[PDB]
Design an enzyme around this catalytic site. Structure first.
Site, mmCIF file in Angstrom:
data_model
loop_
_atom_site.group_PDB
_atom_site.id
_atom_site.type_symbol
_atom_site.label_atom_id
_atom_site.label_comp_id
_atom_site.label_asym_id
_atom_site.label_seq_id
_atom_site.Cartn_x
_atom_site.Cartn_y
_atom_site.Cartn_z
ATOM 1 C CB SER A 162 -0.940 0.041 1.207
ATOM 2 O OG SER A 162 -0.218 0.260 2.402
ATOM 3 C CB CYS A 163 0.087 4.716 -1.080
ATOM 4 S SG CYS A 163 -0.614 4.225 -2.661
ATOM 5 C CD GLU A 164 1.423 8.639 2.774
ATOM 6 O OE1 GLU A 164 2.278 9.145 3.532
ATOM 7 O OE2 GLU A 164 0.339 9.213 2.463
#
Lengths: 417, 429
Positions: free
Chosen positions: B162-164
């Site tokens: 996932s992003c971040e």
């Protein structure tokens, strides 16, 4: 008598590469054919050859496996000088009414001369796009052709037109007894199409960001590339172009469709006896520009902003126009008034003075229609035919559309389409 | 016993990516020898038999791939994929499950190893779920702190796409709890997606969407054709690090490891299985942002649709609705930033990266309340507004309260746009 040509690219910006590229191609055919530069008047906004987005500075192509067509094409009227007054003055051989850094070359023709007029950009309901507002209205256009006929400074005129709703420029306006034959890419109510785009059957070279040619144009440009023009009549070319599409109209003196293509254009050593919407193509370019940019780059940042500004403007104009419809007529019977097609044989509008004032009052509250709002010109046409006056539109256009959005296409700097 | 918890945090045909990864992951574990009974699969079952799927009943995770959907269990599907169910499944608490679930839980003991893999998406210390609310990092790590105290696991590898994703564990996950983490991106960086319509390795032309995520695909291919007895987790990390070719191209996007990295010396056989391979480890893959990948699909769904057809009209509408919502959210968040701090110093507060080693936020109660009050005036952030979760995080750290946010979020953003993504029906991310 002599053979003249007037070539018009009604658009600007790298997005609309295709329109200029068509005009360049058209000049090449005529030059090969034997027409003199002095009798070929070229209207093109000179901003594609040396655009920053052009992969090959100095070259324009009109075919995936094409070579250059830009070299040696005259530049009679370029930049902002491509406006209807100059075009009208160039048609009426009136050098005393030009404005700008133009060449001074005009259609100074006589009664033994044949003329081939070519214009591609884009267009709307009874209006062709130009690269500098205001645009060309059908009433103004046909009045000029009526004056030219009265002066009797031409035998025959073939006028080819690549624009959306191109039939609407002549239908109910162009008389049939004036020796003017028209061949439009679309009828009054239909779009024109574009070929040789980034992702297609005949896709152009990968370095290219944009569609390089329009469908109707390309169709007749190819036919007049590799065919003897002494063995082919305009009616035949019409049939050829027709078979390329998936309507091609003709207007005025269709009697002239029996002449050969040699009378206007020329045949060289040949001796060979005989796609996506225009508005939808512009988005291909933006998406690809933003879809082919390095992530976290300045290009990507600007490409993304440009794309957001475009989409936002198209959604704004559509909503506003829709809303003004619901304010004038109703929510369920307002949609029909706007999206209506008038019976074939009638003009788009009866009151052209009204037509223009309605578009202007729309713009003074909503902003500019740019080249994408030409889709709704018929809507405004239908309003003037429904009998709507400035005082009634002004109220409606201020209620829906109180804010002009802060977009570059919504600007009024030298605006009012 | 060797257990596994797979999670596909997203729904809709757009995110074909995520479920296709979870399918692939199950296939690897099955071949490897793990029993279905110890493999809990969370997938919103809406890709296999979607109307937009050109090959009903098949999902692929590779351009030249074959099916990975057949034989994959369906423990938690549809709206049952929510954090409470995920948390109850992790804590082996069948008594606290809601919906038509299988009831399969992580009923493991102190000699068991578990491999948890979730991909969707994700924001600043928060992962996407298919039904709001979402998984907050505070709530996640509290459950892992509770699991550790119960002493019902030896070792836990947790893989995250996932992003971040680093933001979920950074300054929260303790490094002496026998939990090793391998994120796709650090606290402030996006995750990427490969195998899109127009790429180096483009999928079959009938396909309308990206079929796989970059980080996920990298480790999935490695565990596809290697003797898991001859390969360690550290090696896989190095393999995956090389596979991301965007590390040097773009910013950040560094494959990261959190928690007990000591566990990275173990072989992949302890958590996974190695079938007929016997290939002793030795030694372009083009890709786009996750939020950007979604636009590929919409545009491609409107660029391929026949002119003047029902599909085109709906694809065009969906595309306008997406673009409009993204522009709205960005504007509002930016506006609230100028109202809370300034026009020229308010951009830095929202787009800040906290020093590595600190958590995303100190006050998690505030964190949630700020997101909620922004949503009660502006609409929902959906899966796109997870990009600004860090902004809200920075606000909670700047000492912003509900009363101050509510005023700022009401002045910028007086209207909730009539968009399908702006709806609050079972909302409040």
């Amino acid at each position: 008598g002599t053979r003249w040509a007037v070539l018009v690219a009604g658009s600007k910006g790298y997005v609309n590469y295709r329109h200029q590229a068509d005009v360049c191609h058209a000049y090449q055919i005529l030059k090969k054919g034997g027409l003199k530069d002095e009798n070929i008047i070229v209207f093109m906004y000179d901003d594609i050859a040396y655009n920053e987005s052009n992969p090959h500075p100095g070259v324009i192509i009109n075919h995936p496996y094409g070579s250059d067509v830009y070299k040696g094409v005259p530049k009679d009227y370029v930049g902002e000088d491509i406006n209807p007054p100059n075009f009208y003055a160039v048609l009426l051989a009136n050098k005393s009414a030009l404005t700008g850094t133009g060449s001074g070359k005009v259609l100074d023709s006589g009664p033994n001369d044949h003329v081939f007029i070519y214009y591609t950009n884009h267009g709307g309901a009874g209006v062709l796009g130009m690269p500098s507002k205001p645009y060309i209205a059908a009433s103004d256009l046909n009045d000029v052709l009526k004056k030219k006929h009265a002066s009797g400074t031409y035998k025959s005129i073939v006028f080819y037109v690549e624009s959306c709703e191109s039939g609407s420029m002549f239908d109910g306006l162009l008389p049939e007894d004036h020796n003017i034959y028209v061949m439009g890419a679309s009828d009054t109510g239909e779009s024109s199409w574009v070929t040789y785009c980034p992702l297609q059957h005949p896709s152009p070279p990968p370095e290219y960001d944009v569609c390089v040619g329009d469908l109707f144009s390309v169709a007749w440009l190819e036919d007049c590339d590799v065919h003897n023009l002494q063995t082919e009549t305009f009616q035949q070319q019409y049939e050829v172009v027709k078979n390329k599409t998936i309507h091609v109209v003709q207007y005025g003196d269709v009697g002239l469709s029996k002449q050969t293509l040699f009378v206007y254009m020329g045949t060289d050593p040949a001796n060979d006896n005989n796609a996506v919407s225009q508005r939808d193509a512009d988005l291909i370019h933006y998406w690809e520009k933003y879809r082919r940019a390095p992530e976290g780059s300045s290009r990507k940042a600007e490409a993304k902003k440009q794309l957001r500004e475009v989409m936002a403007h198209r959604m704004h104009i559509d909503n506003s126009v829709k809303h003004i419809g619901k304010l004038l007529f109703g929510i369920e019977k307002g949609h029909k008034m706007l999206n209506n097609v008038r019976p074939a044989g009638l003009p788009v509008v009866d009151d052209w003075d009204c037509f223009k004032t309605l578009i202007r009052t729309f713009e003074t509250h909503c902003g500019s229609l740019s080249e994408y709002g030409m889709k709704h010109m018929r809507s405004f046409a239908n309003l003037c035919n429904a009998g709507i006056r400035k005082e009634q539109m002004a109220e409606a256009s201020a209620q829906a559309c109180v804010s002009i959005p802060d977009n570059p296409w919504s600007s009024l700097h030298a605006g009012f389409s």
